[PDB]
Each structure stands twice: as structure tokens, then as C-alpha cells.
Amino acid sequence: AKITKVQVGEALVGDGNEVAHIDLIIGPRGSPAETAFCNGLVNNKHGFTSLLAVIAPNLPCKPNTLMFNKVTINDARQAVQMFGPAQHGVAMAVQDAVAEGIIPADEADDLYVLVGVFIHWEAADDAKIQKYNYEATKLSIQRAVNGEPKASVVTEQRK
Amino acid sequence: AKITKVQVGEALVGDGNEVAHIDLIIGPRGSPAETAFCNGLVNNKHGFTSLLAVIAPNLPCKPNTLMFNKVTINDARQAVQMFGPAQHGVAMAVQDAVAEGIIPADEADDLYVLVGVFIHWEAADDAKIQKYNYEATKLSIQRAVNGEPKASVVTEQR
Amino acid sequence: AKITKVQVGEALVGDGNEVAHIDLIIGPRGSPAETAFCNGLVNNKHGFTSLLAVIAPNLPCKPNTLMFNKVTINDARQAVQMFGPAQHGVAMAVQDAVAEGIIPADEADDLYVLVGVFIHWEAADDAKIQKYNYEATKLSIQRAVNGEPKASVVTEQRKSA
Amino acid sequence: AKITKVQVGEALVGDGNEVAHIDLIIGPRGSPAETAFCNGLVNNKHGFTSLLAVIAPNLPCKPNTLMFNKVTINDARQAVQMFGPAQHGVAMAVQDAVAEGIIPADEADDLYVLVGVFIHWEAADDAKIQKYNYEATKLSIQRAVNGEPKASVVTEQRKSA
Amino acid sequence: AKITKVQVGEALVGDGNEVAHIDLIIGPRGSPAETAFCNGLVNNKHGFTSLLAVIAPNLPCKPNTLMFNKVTINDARQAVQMFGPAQHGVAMAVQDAVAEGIIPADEADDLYVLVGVFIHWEAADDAKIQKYNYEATKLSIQRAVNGEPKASVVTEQR
Ligand SMILES: [Ca+2]
Ligand code: NA
Ligand code: NA
């Protein structure tokens, strides 16, 4: 609950070739999350795309979510995994976070989410790609919104 | 004014290989839509271009519109589609949105529209490319200007 | 006219293979025109360059002008067309716009001009490349500073006057 | 706070093919380090990646750190090097700087670190790769935070090699 | 202070294959020079690098300087010219500008310099690469810091 500035979250969930790694940023209007969202939607290159995540055709998740790949997409199969299972899991995770109140419903129309997904070339099981990305995204959102892991917590784990 | 902050719209219209998916951003002077517009016109890479959309030679649509592709343009054919039917449909959608009261005419000279078009490699029918991008762009503008869909609506419909 | 905010202009001028299409943005210090100018000079890639336009060696045009290609530069022939005739045409147009008062002389040191140049692979006549890019840039500057075409005008002619 | 503006640090540490060269920027929320962090995480290309540095799985270092390679990653081994020892050395350095108070712990949740890593393709000793990046990062962080070297100091030494 | 806003400089110095062309931006904290410096350090790609210029190992010139290439670096020989003689010339130019009073010593820790270099791949004499880049860089800093050429001056020479 309550997001008044940029927050970063990250998670690794799953196993095998479909394991899902997610880097995430969320922030309000007027912040760098908003400018990076706009620039990120406009700037694409060979192998590296970005899209406005939707949970169903003509139904984008809210808050506005820009999803982009961190592992290069070199053929139709990798693209399909990105736009099908992975997009669906990320989008569902964002909307469920609003449904559950992790992202407050009254801020949801004024926030931006940036989601970097890592889908291995070896991934093949769509049901797992979808599920693991859904879980890694939901986890990254809760960690980002609650500011975790806290500095001191991580500090006292290196010494 | 009606459009006082950055808004994002999206739509998927059509069928077959010419189906049009549009990602759209609209915003006023002083907003990130303006900065994204300037950076986007300046930064291009092989296969990924951007241009100031026009209705006809020497007749840009207003509000100022930056159209850019989201599917790599690998050959001349795709490029002719981008610059021909797709650009015409996008530009017509923007001007028609002003005409239909979707974008207030008194704000037109002070807004920026960013339109990401997705033209499949298999797309081949020019008339459909134009028509569907026109329809998906206009619907994306309509939605963005009104903040649609609202989070509660998506949450509910989820 | 006086330039206190970001203005956008464009023009298509000429015929044959050397036809020039210019997309242009002009703006003051503190505006996104300035930030895109700085990032644009810094960020280059294979086949896509940007340069600080000059009218002569060691003599850039003012206001500061960042020119960048829209068509991939695949060989020396195209790099020379970009750096030779197109650059000279663009730079001359900016400077002439200042000499003519279109860009006021008392603002020229505080503006930034971003110019996207589209040179078709078929272009071959250098005098025409230079001429048409000079004209299209001059025309784009005039349209940008005067805010032309006004939305009301384009709306009335969207179907054609 | 102690780190109230953007600071830049750099360091070259180690020997051999594992020698580590680190370019580093650190700064608070609202500064260009935050904007460059968000953009840098979002914008990747063939051979040039960026990642949120972690000391362990599901355990990112704090302050938030964006690590990116300066040498094109063309094969799988360069990637393992980048993601394995390099990342680990960098991430440890950042946490240790917080532990030692170089980066105050009461602001570690409000700063961003940008770390550019250079790894020659001839590097092979994961053990060195990791220690040199750890040391180069740690040095780069204290140099940035303390504003070293001062301009006056560099000016004095600009001639004596 | 003397450098209180973003300034742009350029110069062409030398002859043969080692001729040096420099495009340059300099500016204070809080200016777009600072933001372009940070973005430019982060964003690199195949053939196009950026680095924090140093006079010697562990000795960066000050003001903080981001040097980047404008000509594609395709092989190890071009990379060595970039990181070796060109970098040394650029870094010495920045430090000498401070020593010669071109950049105020008391502003040196608060400025950012962005230097774009154009090394022809045919360039072969390292001493000339270093000398011409040093000369073009110092001249570009001198021009930028003083706003030269002034528009009236270029207009008169045109
Ligand atoms: Ca880029
Ligand atoms: Na409407
Ligand atoms: Na001087």
C-alpha cells in the first residue's frame, strides 16, 4: 500500500528451463518511473522489445505496465513465449496485486510499472512460463512496495 | 483543459495478418510525452524508425504525432507499408479524433501523440492495414484521453 | 518569430531520387529540445549517426543544430551524401533563417534545432541533394516557428479543404 | 545526508587478464542517477545487458545497484563471467561500503548506484575476476563519495605521468 | 561562476588520416550535460562505447569527462587507438584547459564534459592521433565555454 516514489523489486522463481527472473520498478506520475515508461515504450531494437501488458485482448492491466525482455528474442518461438504465457502471467500478477490491495486501488490509475523478464531460449512449457512469471512478478511487486529487502537486513547478511 | 497529464491507450482491431495492435501515449507540453516525442524522433536504429505522421505530403496531422514501429522492418515492402497505409491510417485517426471531439480542438496545437504500430511480417492487404490501424489508433486515443480502462474496471472484469 | 517553447515543423521538397523529407524540432534552453539535443549527440549506432551541423570546417551554424539520418547509412557513398551536400544544405538553411529574422538573432545563441534527414538510396545528384535539403529545412523552420499548419487548418482539409 | 548529489568514481585494480576497470556513479532520489538507473534497467541490446546486482538469489544489494557491461558479451562464457563472479564482487563491495559507513546506512534505501564493468575476453580466473571487481568497486565508491581525486590534485599531477 | 549553463563546442584539427574532429558539450550540475553524461556512461552498443577519460591509470581528468566514439570501432586496432592516444589527448586537453584558465579551477569539480571523437580507421600514427585530438578538444572547450561562434559572427561569415 501507498506508493509515493520510485521502488525497486526483484525475484527468481521456478526451476528448470522455465525458471523466471523478474526485475521491477514501480512509481508515480511525475517520477522517473513515468519517464522511463514512456521512453521504454518508444525505444525498441532488434531482439529487444517492450509492450504494454494486457490480461486479455483490448484489456491492459492497470497500473500501466511496460514489459520488456532482458534475454534477446531471436526467433518466432521466443516471441510467442514473451507475448503469450509470460505477458499473461505478468499482467495477471499486476492486476491481482491491485485486487488484493498491495497496490492501492486509489493509486492504480496514477502509477507505472516497469517489468524486465528473462526467458531462457530453452524454455518450452508454457504453463510453467506463465506460472513462474506470475509468481516472480507478484513477489517483486510486494518486495518493491514494501521496500524489501531493507538495507540493514541485507547489510547484516554480509556481516 | 481535458488532457492535462500523460495518458496511455491501447487497442487491437482487425483479423488475419493485417490485424492492428496499437500502443499509444498522449500528453501535453511539459510532460514526459513531450520529452519522449523529442527523444523518439532523434533516436532510430536499423529496422526501427520513427516519423512525424502526415495526412498527405506537407500536411502533418495535429496534434504532432510520432509514429514508430514495434516489429522490425527488414525489407522495403514492410517499409512501404509503414510509410504508406499504416501512416495514413494513423494520421487520419488523429485528425478525425480532433474532428469528432475526442481530442479538443483548442488543445490540439499543444499535445503530443506517440503511436507504436505492430505490422506483422505476413501483412499484405494495404486497404486492411490502413483501415485497421486507423480504427485501432482512434480507439486507443479515445481510451487514453479518458483514462480507460479504469483500474476498478479491469480489476472487476479480471 | 519568437521561440519560447518546443515547436515542430516538417516539409517534403524536390523531385526524383533526391527529394528531401525533413522532420524538425526547435526549442529553447531548459526545454526537451535541449535534452534531446545532448542525448542525441552522445547516442550513436551502426548506420545511424548524428552530427553538429557546420556551414564550413570549424564553423558550426547557430543555433546549435543536431542533424541525424533516417535512412540507414550502409556505405561510404551514403555517408558522404549525409556529411557533404545534406549537411551543407541543412546548415545553410539554419543560418539563412537567422539572417532573415525567421529565427531571431537575439535568440539564436539559446536555441537547439534537431533535424532528421531522409536521403533515399536512389539519390545521386549532389547539387539537388544540397538544394532540396536546404529548401525543406528552411521551410520546416518557418513552419515550426510560426506554428504551421494550425490544427484547425489541417482538420478542415483532412478530407481536403 | 552525506551523499546529496551525483558523484562519479573510477578505479583500475588487479593484474593480468582479470584486471578490473570500474566506472561508477552514485546519487540520491530526484537526481540524474535515479533517472539513469531506471532507463538503464529498461534499455538493453545485443551484447549489452544491465542487471539489478544481487549478493545472493532473491537478495539484491542495497543501495539499489545497476550493473552493466562495457565489453560486448558475444558468447556464453562472457555471460557467466558477467553474471557470476563480477556481479558477486560488485554486489559485495556495495554492501561492504554500507557496512563500513562509506555509504551511510540511513540513506542506503534512497540512493542508486550505477556500475560499468569491463571484462577482457581473455579473463579466465573467476577467483581474480571476483576479487578485482570487488576492490575496484569499493575504491570507486569511496572515491565518488569523497569526491576524489580533487581537480586541484589532478591538475598538479597532470604532467608528472 | 563562468560556466553556468550547457555549452556546445567543436573543432577540426590536423591533416592526413589522423585528422581530429571533436564535438563537445560542457555543463554544470543540474543541467542536461549532467543527465546526458550519466545516460551516456550507461548506454553502450556494438561498436559504440563511452568511458570516463583518464590522464593515467586511476587518475581521471577533472572535470568529469565522458569520451565516446562517433566512428564505429570494429576491431582491436581501432579500440587501442581510442583508449590509448585519443583518450590521453582528450584527458590532457581537459586538464590543461583547467591549468590555462579556460575552465575555472573552482568549478572543475562541478562540471561535466562530453567529448565525441572521430577516429578514421585509416589513422596510423599514434603521436598525431594524440596531438590532434588534444588540440581539437582544447579548442572545442575554449569555444564552448565562451559560446563561440556567436550567431552574429557566423551570420556575418554567411
Ligand atoms: Ca538507445
Ligand atoms: Na470522446
Ligand atoms: Na579562455
mmCIF file of C-alpha atoms in Angstrom, chain C:
data_model
loop_
_atom_site.group_PDB
_atom_site.id
_atom_site.type_symbol
_atom_site.label_atom_id
_atom_site.label_comp_id
_atom_site.label_asym_id
_atom_site.label_seq_id
_atom_site.Cartn_x
_atom_site.Cartn_y
_atom_site.Cartn_z
ATOM 1 C CA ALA C 1 9.065 34.743 -34.846
ATOM 2 C CA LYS C 2 9.963 34.416 -31.073
ATOM 3 C CA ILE C 3 10.638 30.862 -29.873
ATOM 4 C CA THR C 4 9.752 30.254 -26.238
ATOM 5 C CA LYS C 5 8.777 26.615 -26.417
ATOM 6 C CA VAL C 6 9.282 23.445 -28.401
ATOM 7 C CA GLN C 7 8.000 23.809 -31.975
ATOM 8 C CA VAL C 8 7.840 21.056 -34.658
ATOM 9 C CA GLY C 9 7.965 21.515 -38.422
ATOM 10 C CA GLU C 10 8.291 19.255 -41.445
ATOM 11 C CA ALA C 11 8.491 19.511 -45.227
ATOM 12 C CA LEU C 12 8.906 17.474 -48.395
ATOM 13 C CA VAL C 13 10.658 19.340 -51.223
ATOM 14 C CA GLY C 14 12.058 18.375 -54.591
ATOM 15 C CA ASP C 15 11.655 15.674 -57.182
ATOM 16 C CA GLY C 16 13.194 12.487 -58.419
ATOM 17 C CA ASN C 17 15.569 10.488 -56.217
ATOM 18 C CA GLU C 18 16.996 13.499 -54.447
ATOM 19 C CA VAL C 19 13.647 14.556 -52.987
ATOM 20 C CA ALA C 20 14.214 15.793 -49.409
ATOM 21 C CA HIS C 21 11.965 14.977 -46.433
ATOM 22 C CA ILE C 22 12.828 16.899 -43.234
ATOM 23 C CA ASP C 23 11.425 16.397 -39.714
ATOM 24 C CA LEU C 24 12.449 19.250 -37.410
ATOM 25 C CA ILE C 25 12.217 20.323 -33.832
ATOM 26 C CA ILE C 26 13.409 23.648 -32.462
ATOM 27 C CA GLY C 27 13.321 24.724 -28.821
ATOM 28 C CA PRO C 28 14.978 26.894 -26.100
ATOM 29 C CA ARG C 29 17.338 26.205 -23.232
ATOM 30 C CA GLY C 30 15.549 24.324 -20.496
ATOM 31 C CA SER C 31 13.167 22.620 -22.959
ATOM 32 C CA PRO C 32 13.115 18.982 -24.158
ATOM 33 C CA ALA C 33 14.692 20.184 -27.399
ATOM 34 C CA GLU C 34 17.909 20.832 -25.414
ATOM 35 C CA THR C 35 17.879 17.471 -23.615
ATOM 36 C CA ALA C 36 17.181 15.531 -26.824
ATOM 37 C CA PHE C 37 19.994 17.526 -28.498
ATOM 38 C CA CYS C 38 22.546 16.431 -25.807
ATOM 39 C CA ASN C 39 21.434 12.796 -25.683
ATOM 40 C CA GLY C 40 21.200 12.705 -29.433
ATOM 41 C CA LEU C 41 24.786 13.883 -29.996
ATOM 42 C CA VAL C 42 26.021 11.267 -27.490
ATOM 43 C CA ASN C 43 23.991 8.190 -28.539
ATOM 44 C CA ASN C 44 25.008 6.779 -31.947
ATOM 45 C CA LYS C 45 24.768 3.246 -33.509
ATOM 46 C CA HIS C 46 25.791 1.247 -36.526
ATOM 47 C CA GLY C 47 24.375 3.042 -39.585
ATOM 48 C CA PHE C 48 22.743 5.845 -37.538
ATOM 49 C CA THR C 49 24.763 8.896 -36.831
ATOM 50 C CA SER C 50 24.228 12.395 -35.609
ATOM 51 C CA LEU C 51 26.380 15.446 -36.121
ATOM 52 C CA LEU C 52 26.712 19.027 -35.035
ATOM 53 C CA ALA C 53 25.968 20.723 -38.374
ATOM 54 C CA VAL C 54 28.533 23.142 -39.797
ATOM 55 C CA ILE C 55 28.464 25.570 -42.698
ATOM 56 C CA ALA C 56 32.249 25.290 -43.076
ATOM 57 C CA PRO C 57 35.159 23.489 -41.349
ATOM 58 C CA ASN C 58 35.436 24.894 -37.855
ATOM 59 C CA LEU C 59 32.269 26.932 -38.329
ATOM 60 C CA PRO C 60 29.039 25.424 -36.971
ATOM 61 C CA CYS C 61 25.750 27.049 -37.702
ATOM 62 C CA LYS C 62 23.956 28.747 -34.781
ATOM 63 C CA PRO C 63 21.589 27.953 -33.332
ATOM 64 C CA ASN C 64 23.219 24.634 -32.399
ATOM 65 C CA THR C 65 21.896 22.052 -34.839
ATOM 66 C CA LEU C 66 21.929 18.270 -34.442
ATOM 67 C CA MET C 67 21.303 16.560 -37.787
ATOM 68 C CA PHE C 68 20.652 12.759 -37.924
ATOM 69 C CA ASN C 69 19.860 10.332 -40.726
ATOM 70 C CA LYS C 70 16.556 8.425 -41.052
ATOM 71 C CA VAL C 71 17.780 6.078 -43.792
ATOM 72 C CA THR C 72 20.493 3.586 -42.804
ATOM 73 C CA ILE C 73 23.971 4.561 -43.924
ATOM 74 C CA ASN C 74 25.369 1.353 -45.402
ATOM 75 C CA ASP C 75 28.317 2.612 -47.365
ATOM 76 C CA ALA C 76 30.744 5.435 -47.982
ATOM 77 C CA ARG C 77 28.633 6.880 -50.759
ATOM 78 C CA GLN C 78 25.743 7.457 -48.349
ATOM 79 C CA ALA C 79 27.992 8.771 -45.543
ATOM 80 C CA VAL C 80 29.447 11.312 -47.969
ATOM 81 C CA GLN C 81 25.967 12.408 -49.101
ATOM 82 C CA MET C 82 24.961 12.914 -45.458
ATOM 83 C CA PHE C 83 28.125 14.795 -44.447
ATOM 84 C CA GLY C 84 28.653 16.738 -47.659
ATOM 85 C CA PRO C 85 25.601 18.081 -49.557
ATOM 86 C CA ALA C 86 22.841 17.363 -46.990
ATOM 87 C CA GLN C 87 24.824 18.799 -44.087
ATOM 88 C CA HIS C 88 25.740 21.925 -46.050
ATOM 89 C CA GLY C 89 22.139 22.403 -47.189
ATOM 90 C CA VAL C 90 20.823 21.979 -43.663
ATOM 91 C CA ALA C 91 23.431 24.259 -42.112
ATOM 92 C CA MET C 92 22.929 26.986 -44.752
ATOM 93 C CA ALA C 93 19.177 26.855 -44.132
ATOM 94 C CA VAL C 94 19.571 27.323 -40.402
ATOM 95 C CA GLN C 95 21.971 30.226 -40.841
ATOM 96 C CA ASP C 96 19.843 31.863 -43.509
ATOM 97 C CA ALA C 97 16.803 31.508 -41.225
ATOM 98 C CA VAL C 98 18.767 33.568 -38.700
ATOM 99 C CA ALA C 99 19.981 36.093 -41.323
ATOM 100 C CA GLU C 100 16.378 36.547 -42.386
ATOM 101 C CA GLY C 101 14.965 37.049 -38.903
ATOM 102 C CA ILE C 102 12.831 33.874 -39.058
ATOM 103 C CA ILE C 103 14.909 32.737 -36.050
ATOM 104 C CA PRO C 104 15.663 35.943 -34.202
ATOM 105 C CA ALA C 105 19.348 36.851 -33.942
ATOM 106 C CA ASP C 106 18.909 37.666 -30.263
ATOM 107 C CA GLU C 107 17.650 34.128 -29.537
ATOM 108 C CA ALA C 108 19.952 32.156 -31.851
ATOM 109 C CA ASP C 109 22.559 31.561 -29.191
ATOM 110 C CA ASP C 110 19.976 29.987 -26.921
ATOM 111 C CA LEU C 111 18.057 27.566 -29.146
ATOM 112 C CA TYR C 112 18.551 23.968 -30.275
ATOM 113 C CA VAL C 113 17.498 22.564 -33.644
ATOM 114 C CA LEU C 114 17.036 18.800 -34.234
ATOM 115 C CA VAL C 115 16.906 17.816 -37.930
ATOM 116 C CA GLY C 116 16.015 14.336 -39.212
ATOM 117 C CA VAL C 117 17.175 13.950 -42.851
ATOM 118 C CA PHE C 118 15.780 11.214 -45.156
ATOM 119 C CA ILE C 119 18.067 10.523 -48.105
ATOM 120 C CA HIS C 120 16.724 7.818 -50.481
ATOM 121 C CA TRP C 121 19.234 5.154 -51.626
ATOM 122 C CA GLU C 122 18.445 6.301 -55.181
ATOM 123 C CA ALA C 123 19.730 9.894 -54.584
ATOM 124 C CA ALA C 124 22.674 10.682 -56.850
ATOM 125 C CA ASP C 125 22.779 14.375 -57.856
ATOM 126 C CA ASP C 126 24.674 16.223 -55.123
ATOM 127 C CA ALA C 127 23.618 19.715 -56.151
ATOM 128 C CA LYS C 128 19.964 18.588 -55.842
ATOM 129 C CA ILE C 129 20.517 16.797 -52.512
ATOM 130 C CA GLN C 130 22.035 20.033 -51.177
ATOM 131 C CA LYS C 131 19.374 22.261 -52.740
ATOM 132 C CA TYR C 132 16.346 20.269 -51.652
ATOM 133 C CA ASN C 133 17.580 19.704 -48.148
ATOM 134 C CA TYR C 134 18.299 23.440 -47.886
ATOM 135 C CA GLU C 135 14.742 24.234 -49.033
ATOM 136 C CA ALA C 136 12.965 21.591 -46.968
ATOM 137 C CA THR C 137 14.944 22.627 -43.823
ATOM 138 C CA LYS C 138 14.201 26.339 -44.457
ATOM 139 C CA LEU C 139 10.542 25.522 -44.960
ATOM 140 C CA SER C 140 10.439 23.310 -41.848
ATOM 141 C CA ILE C 141 11.976 26.072 -39.739
ATOM 142 C CA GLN C 142 9.379 28.623 -40.950
ATOM 143 C CA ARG C 143 6.518 26.217 -40.290
ATOM 144 C CA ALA C 144 7.829 25.325 -36.848
ATOM 145 C CA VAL C 145 8.395 28.903 -35.655
ATOM 146 C CA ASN C 146 5.007 30.066 -36.966
ATOM 147 C CA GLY C 147 3.201 27.031 -35.601
ATOM 148 C CA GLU C 148 2.053 25.947 -39.106
ATOM 149 C CA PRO C 149 -0.132 24.203 -40.057
ATOM 150 C CA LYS C 150 -2.587 25.127 -37.275
ATOM 151 C CA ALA C 151 -4.714 22.148 -36.201
ATOM 152 C CA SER C 152 -7.926 23.941 -37.350
ATOM 153 C CA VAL C 153 -6.471 24.238 -40.843
ATOM 154 C CA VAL C 154 -5.417 20.547 -41.056
ATOM 155 C CA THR C 155 -8.807 19.474 -39.625
ATOM 156 C CA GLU C 156 -10.686 21.466 -42.314
ATOM 157 C CA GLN C 157 -8.570 19.849 -45.044
ATOM 158 C CA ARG C 158 -8.243 16.341 -43.564
ATOM 159 C CA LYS C 159 -10.632 15.166 -46.286
ATOM 160 C CA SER C 160 -9.213 18.012 -48.460
ATOM 161 C CA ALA C 161 -10.343 21.632 -47.941
#
